[PDB]
């Protein structure tokens, strides 16, 4: 029907407004109080919009369908449906034009920049505070020149009436009708050509692009100022009949009434030639009313109703969280839905949920109608509803029949990630609560404290099949965030399993040997033996061969009875060893994942359900309970407390002696209290975990304590050692609300009685945590919304692009600790190239091979240390990413399918854990390994030691197998006692330098001669307290003489004869340069050796906010300056606080110049030759420079490292693919440096894909592409700057986006998910994708 291909948006001339109009409103009246009827020519004028009763004229001349389209004669009401009252729009014709508020207040003001006039003047003239000259000839007054009233008098008396100067709206309209697009365009182009100041160039170019867009759109600037105002159809602004004959009205009625009043007042004033003062005042009032109607609150004191509340303008109706978009487009309320409190279900099968009878009946009422009529038990809908409403038995029978196989959707608010809504087969259950399977409830992040869940129903069989295929719970075992299982036992299930997997030294029937698990169950059920007996059992097992068959075997193994009984339900195929240990929660998860990988879905789900049942049964049987005596208090607690009290008393006494400072005393008191807390905690743990049992031989022996509290704590189900410390030990130090730690810790535990003071201390931390999470939820939700908005477009489109570019992945190691092994990182990725066997030319793994588990084992066996993999950051494709470039799905355990929308998955996965994210010299080798150095340049002193001459060297420890396990940064000038390739043992210090002292090295031996060294002007002589030696301190530019600033201090190396020693490898003399405040202890002529230093120069991030800023890429406070181009360094004149520094390329003829804040600590020296992107100044680094200098891959790696580190610190697991996807989304904008043969314009920020395609086709034609750089933009900016303007308007700042699109006149092509959602047609993702493929055929066919 409508099947509209696109949407067009542009400014509307008054002509088309009149075309839309079906008359004009002329009276500020709505309905008669006496008779609730629409007025004659008011806001509900029937003869303008339509009748109130369907096909019924107001005068009653016609009341039947036969009069369809008949227009009344008596009162002029056409006979049609009442619904038309939503379509025809009114209009009002104003005596004098007035501007449109957005085109003025929305910065930047389009009107002002179009006119090249500042906004202040525009406002002043608009509200009639000054005059502006439309036309001036021989008058010595310029166009656009503003004159005030007395200036107006002077001009008129000095020039008669030759000039024309007027008030705001009309004159603005005139001059808009008095401008030449192309002439001003070419003039501005010439100005841009001749300009010198960059800022003026930017102003000129923004004006140029605005006027160019206006020209291309064809809209007239005269339309920019309103004269005829459309009137919203009355039905959208109803009049609710309130009780007692009153009414409830929208603010829109008030705004329109005020506007009507002002307009009619203005016209009645105008027609009789009133004095100019009052007419101008009333015109100003009319303009104010128009502004209030459009956007109240956009200027000054907003007009308000009696409630002293702002009136909802149209902008308010569109903007805002409660605005039209978020309230009615993306948040529609739907029918065939219900909600209820949830309750546990311990017997439901995993793929089904319990459903209350009454709610199910209400929901499926239409289906009952349909089938009942189909079975003919009633003749009509009326009889059907009468029969169902009294709940006959046949009603219930039909309800049972209808729902036998009919999935329903269960959802819980908020919907953090894709598991927040899942499908379930319903089973009808008497009651009023929804029963759920425990595993799904745990996966839901839902607790039964009274949380409510909503339920929906898919009507169409297509939707039902879709729900069965994907939304069914069974098919969602692996979290899309990361391939780990999400359906995991928790609480009592884990408790029971851990109880059943333990073992005691001496138990009933211990030492017997059984046949099989059958006998184990029989023996236990008879009670003849405990679950904990250590017994021999003949167990059989199967194993998958190379052929996929289950080879059998059996043997007698020593295990526990519980282990055998548990193995009874283990699916056939898994190795027995997985169950021959104490099973923790993580152990259970790993075993379940192993089962899922080895076998199919059905064995895995059956295993999960049977585990649930068995664990519940034996947890109930065990009957673990909490007693008072369980919180055992170590006796030594009193001794530890006494020791701490004695030591703190001694500290206080010594502080009263003044021998220690208040801060030092505070610090040491903190430290000693912490040590005491650690001691008491370890005492508690040692007392708890271990228990002495009499063995079979009547002898005591230690074993794991069966204490219930410790049993819970170790099992990991709702227990952590910190809680146990607070339970049976000193809960320790607290934090003041400022974050400072109180000196006196809270000594007592919870079992011990708490002093009121201690409780009043702890409540500070408690309330701080509560408020923190209260704010954190909102902040995380906002960030997730932003990410979803940004990453909506990216959808898998092609299987393989064919690219060869990849990215390098290595395990992450800092401080000698492998934070993440390479195996987890690269599992499920796609190889960039064929990978060779390390050390050999044999290709270990071929290219474009999915790295499944076997490949992971193969590579880790071969001691692979670094790999290259295809990435989504470099998939050369348009409007999508190659499937091979994305790798294996994290959910379905295989390569992704064409049609999946990655971006939403990535955004949800990254945003969900935010609720847990918080928001408030000498190096000893850790291992026996081989020392290695990178980019290492070094010198050997006369002592034979190794000082370093490179500034960015890394020191690593590589194992004998070719793998690295340590990583450290080597400061320039540090001392190393071990060279590269040398084997060292653990604990060996091999790093030597002073962080506080900055040394400057000397290359070879000789004598140091000072040049430009003059006392007072450059240096000073002093007697140091440390050595008592005559020392020369280089004076800083501010401290030194102004004339001595030009005297740059320098040190040259001469031989024994005084001839300058030239640096090896160069002819230039060895010329070093001491900066300001540098200190040289030696004197002019003292002898030095190789590697001698004579300069002794003197030397947080919250979880969620840091992540947000990194995604937003806000500029770091101190940007670390980087090298634009490689080459030698050189210095020039000094500015006030700044210095001129020039990098001269080794071969490049263009030495780049830069200004450096001198008070910032520079690192490079003049004689240094550095590479592009080198860290000139140490400190925080902005991503933008990283991109512009090093490239995309460095940015990707840095961002991934930062985000992964933050989440690792908090303790959450996120796969890198999502971060890569986000980054790939952030880089869709490219600036055109040179167009080449392309049609684009220089300096234009365009889609990278667009320029990619253009250059591709140009080279296909043999033409010249366009030179371009890529830009990293903040998520908000990169989002609102997209092309599908509708999506951006839905996101935020609707005014700016709408105004820009209108003045540009864009044309969207419905390629965005949100776009199709708002339109309400099939999305180009998932199942619909193939349909749109057919669409791509049809549009090609047509």
């Amino acid at each position: 029907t409508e099947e509209f291909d696109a949407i067009k948006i542009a400014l509307a001339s008054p002509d088309m407004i009149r075309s839309w109009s079906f008359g004009e409103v002329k009276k500020p009246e709505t309905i008669n109080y006496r008779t609730f009827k629409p007025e004659r020519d008011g806001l509900f004028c029937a003869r303008i919009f339509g009748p109130v009763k369907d096909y019924e004229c107001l005068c009653g001349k016609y009341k039947r369908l036969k009069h369809r389209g008949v227009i009344c004669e008596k009162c002029g009401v056409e006979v049609t449906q009442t619904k038309v009252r939503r379509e025809r729009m009114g209009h009002i014709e104003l005596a004098s034009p007035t501007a449109h508020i957005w085109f003025l207040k929305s910065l930047p003001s389009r009107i002002g920049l179009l006119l090249d006039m500042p906004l202040r003047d525009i406002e002043r003239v608009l509200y009639f505070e000054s005059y502006v000259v439309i036309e001036g000839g021989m008058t010595n007054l310029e166009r656009q020149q503003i004159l005030t009233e007395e200036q107006y008098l002077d001009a008129l008396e000095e020039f008669g009436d030759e000039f024309d100067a007027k008030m705001g709206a009309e004159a603005i309209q005139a001059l808009l009708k008095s401008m030449d697009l192309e002439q001003e365009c070419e003039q501005l182009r010439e100005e841009l050509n001749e300009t010198n100041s960059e800022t003026k160039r930017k102003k000129l170019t923004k004006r140029i692009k605005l006027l160019e867009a206006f020209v291309q759109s064809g809209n007239k600037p005269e339309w920019m100022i309103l004269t005829v105002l459309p009137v919203l159809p009355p039905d959208l602004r109803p009049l609710v009949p309130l009780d007692g004959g009153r009414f409830a009205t929208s603010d829109l009625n008030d705004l329109y009434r005020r506007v009507i009043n002002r307009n009619n007042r203005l016209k009645r004033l105008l027609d009789l030639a009133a004095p100019d003062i009052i007419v101008r005042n009333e015109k100003r009032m009319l303009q104010e009313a128009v502004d209030a109607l459009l956007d109240n609150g956009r200027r000054g004191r907003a007009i308000t109703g009696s409630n002293k509340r702002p009136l909802k303008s149209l902008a308010d109706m569109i903007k805002g969280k409660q605005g039209r978009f978020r309230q009615n487009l993306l948040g529609k309320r739907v029918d065939y839905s219900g909600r209820s409190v949830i309750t546990v279900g311990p017997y439901l099968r995993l793929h089904q949920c319990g459903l209350p009878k009454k709610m199910a009946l209400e929901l499926f009422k239409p289906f009952i109608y349909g089938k009942l009529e189909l079975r003919g038990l009633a003749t009509t809908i009326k009889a059907a509803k009468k029969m169902v409403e009294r709940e006959e038995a046949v009603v219930w029978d039909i309800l049972d029949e209808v729902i036998r196989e009919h999935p329903v959707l269960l959802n819980r608010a908020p919907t953090l990630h894709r598991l927040g809504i899942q499908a379930f087969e319903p089973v009808l259950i008497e009651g009023k609560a929804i029963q759920l399977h425990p595993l799904v409830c745990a996966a839901y992040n839902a607790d039964f404290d009274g949380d409510q869940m909503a339920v929906h129903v898919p009507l169409t069989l297509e939707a039902q099949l879709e729900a069965r295929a994907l939304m069914m719970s069974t098919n969602n075992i692996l979290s899309p965030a990361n391939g780990e299982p999400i359906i995991v036992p928790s609480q009592d299930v884990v408790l029971g399993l851990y109880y059943m997997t333990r073992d005691c030294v001496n138990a009933k029937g211990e030492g017997m040997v059984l046949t099989g698990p059958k006998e184990a169950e029989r023996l236990y059920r008879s009670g003849l033996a405990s679950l904990h007996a250590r017994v021999k059992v003949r167990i059989t097992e199967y194993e998958k061969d190379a052929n996929g068959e289950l080879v059998a075997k059996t043997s007698l193994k020593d295990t526990t009875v519980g282990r055998a009984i548990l193995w009874m339900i283990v699916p056939k195929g898994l190795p027995y060893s997985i169950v021959n240990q104490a099973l923790g929660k993580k152990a259970i998860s790993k075993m379940l994942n192993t089962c899922y990988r080895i076998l199919g879905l059905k064995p895995t789900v059956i295993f999960a359900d049977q585990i649930m049942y068995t664990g519940f049964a034996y947890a109930a049987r065990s009957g673990a309970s909490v007693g008072i005596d369980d919180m055992v208090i170590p006796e030594k607690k009193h001794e530890i407390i006494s020791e701490a009290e004695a030591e703190v008393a001694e500290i206080q006494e010594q502080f009263q002696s003044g021998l220690v400072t208040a801060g030092e005393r505070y610090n040491k008191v903190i430290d000693i209290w912490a040590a005491a807390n650690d001691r008491v905690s370890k005492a508690m743990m040692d007392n708890l975990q271990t228990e002495t049992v009499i063995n079979r031989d009547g002898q005591e022996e230690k074993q794991v304590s069966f204490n219930s509290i410790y049993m819970m704590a170790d099992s990991g189900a709702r227990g952590s050692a910190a809680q146990i410390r607070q339970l049976a030990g000193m809960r320790g130090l607290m934090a003041k609300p400022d974050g400072s730690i109180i000196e006196t810790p809270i000594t007592a535990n919870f079992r011990e009685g708490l002093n009121v003071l201690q409780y009043f201390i702890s409540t500070h931390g408690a309330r701080k945590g509560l408020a923190d999470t209260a704010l954190k939820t909102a902040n995380s939700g906002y960030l997730t919304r932003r990410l979803v908005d940004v990453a909506q477009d990216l959808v898998v489109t092609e299987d393989d692009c064919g690219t060869h570019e990849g990215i390098m992945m290595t395990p992450v190691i800092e401080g000698g600790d492998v934070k993440e092994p390479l195996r987890d990182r690269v599992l499920g990725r796609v190889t960039a190239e064929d990978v060779l066997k390390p050390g050999t030319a044999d290709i270990l793994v071929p290219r474009n091979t999915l790295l499944h588990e076997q490949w992971c084992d193969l590579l880790e066996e071969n001691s692979v240390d670094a790999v290259k993999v295809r990435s989504v950051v470099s998939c050369d494709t348009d409007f999508g990413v190659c499937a091979h470039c994305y790798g294996r799905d994290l959910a379905r355990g295989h390569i992704i399918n064409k049609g999946e929308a990655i971006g939403v998955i990535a955004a949800q996965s990254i945003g969900e854990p935010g609720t847990q994210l918080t928001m408030r010299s000498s190096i000893q080798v850790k291992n026996k390994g081989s020392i290695k150095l990178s980019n290492v340049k070094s010198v050997v002193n006369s002592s034979g030691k190794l000082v370093i001459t490179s500034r960015n060297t890394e020191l690593k420890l590589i194992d004998e197998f070719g793998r690295t396990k340590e990583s450290y940064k080597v400061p320039y000038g540090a001392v190393l006692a071990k060279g590269d390739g040398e084997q060292v043992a653990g604990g060996e210090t091999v790093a030597n330098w002073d962080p506080h002292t900055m040394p400057v090295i000397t290359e070879v031996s000789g004598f140091v001669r000072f040049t430009d060294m003059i006392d007072g002007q450059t240096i000073t002589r002093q007697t140091d307290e440390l050595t008592g030696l005559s020392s020369l301190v280089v004076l800083d530019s501010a401290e030194r003489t102004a004339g001595g600033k030009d005297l740059r201090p320098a040190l040259k190396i001469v031989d024994a004869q005084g001839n300058d020693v030239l640096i090896p490898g160069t002819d230039m003399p060895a010329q070093y340069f001491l900066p300001g405040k540098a200190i040289v202890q030696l004197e002019d002529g003292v002898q030095i050796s190789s590697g001698d230093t004579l300069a002794r120069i003197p030397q947080i991030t919250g979880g969620l906010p840091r992540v947000a800023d990194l995604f937003e890429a806000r500029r770091p406070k101190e940007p670390a300056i980087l090298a634009e181009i490689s080459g030698i360094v050189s210095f020039g004149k000094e500015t006030k606080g700044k210095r001129r520094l020039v990098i001269t390329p080794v071969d490049g003829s263009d030495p780049y110049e830069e200004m450096i804040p001198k008070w910032r600590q520079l690192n490079v020296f003049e004689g240094e030759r550095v590479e592009r992107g080198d860290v000139i100044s140490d400190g925080p680094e902005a991503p933008h420079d990283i991109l512009r200098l090093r490239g995309v891959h460095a940015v990707t790696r840095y961002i991934v490292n930062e985000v992964q580190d933050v989440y690792r610190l908090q303790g959450v697991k996120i796969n890198d693919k999502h971060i890569e996807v986000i980054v790939r989304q952030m880089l869709r904008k490219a600036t055109i440096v040179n167009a080449g043969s392309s049609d684009f314009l220089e300096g234009e920020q365009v889609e990278y894909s667009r320029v990619k395609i253009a250059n591709r086709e140009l080279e296909a034609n043999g033409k010249v592409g366009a030179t371009y750089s890529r830009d990293l933009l903040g998520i908000t900016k990169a989002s609102l700057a997209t092309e599908s303007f509708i999506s951006a308007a839905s996101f935020q700042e609707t005014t700016r986006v709408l105004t820009e699109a209108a003045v540009a006149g864009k044309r969207d092509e419905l390629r965005g998910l949100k776009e199709n959602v708002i339109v309400g047609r099939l999305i180009p993702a998932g199942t619909g994708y193939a349909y749109h493929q057919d669409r791509m055929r049809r549009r090609a066919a047509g």
Partner: protein
Amino acid sequence: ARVTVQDAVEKIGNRFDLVLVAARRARQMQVGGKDPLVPEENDKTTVIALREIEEGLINNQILDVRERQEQQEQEAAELQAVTAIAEGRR
């Protein structure tokens, strides 16, 4: 009764192709009255369509063959009917 579609997933090769093919077949089932190729077991149209799609020798190309045969035979029937009308006129 069905609990998982993994068998059908590997049978066809994709979730979405499965959805589309099964939906079209079940559409033919519900309004076309075409008897299923699999025993019913009182299951709904959705379940029986799923059973047919899993190794019941049904795919997109198979149903394309089916519909091609159907359109050919109904066009032949219409041609025969028009011929019979012409003969009656003659």
